[PDB]
Amino acid sequence: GTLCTLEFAVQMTCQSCVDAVRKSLQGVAGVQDVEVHLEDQMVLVHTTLPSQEVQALLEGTGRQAVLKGMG
């Protein structure tokens, strides 16, 4: 698997949940970096993981996640 930006749409509305997704994402094996956009309700994930896996990882933050595509 090679490094790419995954651009996901997610269910959140306040600043504590953004940070909870960022800290569920932080330190994961196969993630380089992230950028989280509460203003688009979007999540960028710079990763070698399959987007099927990152969806189920994002789902592990208590909310739904739907991919839009790659950067």
Total length of the chain? 71
Work out whether 16 is an interface residue with Cu ion (CB under 5 A).
yes
47-63 core/surface letters (b: 16 or more CB in 10 A; e: else): bebebeebbebbeebee
Does position 20 bind Cu ion by CB under 5 A? Answer: no
Q: Which residue has tokens 């896996």?
A: 53
Q: CB of residue 16 vs Cu ion: minimum separation in angstroms?
A: 4
Least Å distance, CB 19 to Cu ion, is 8
In angstroms, the CA 13 to CA 28 distance is 24
Least distance (Å) between residue 14 CB and Cu ion: 3
Residue 4 known to bind ligand: no
- Among 1, 2, 14, 27, indicate the residue that binds Cu ion (CB under 5 A): 14
Sites of contact with Cu ion (CB under 5 A) = 14, 16-17
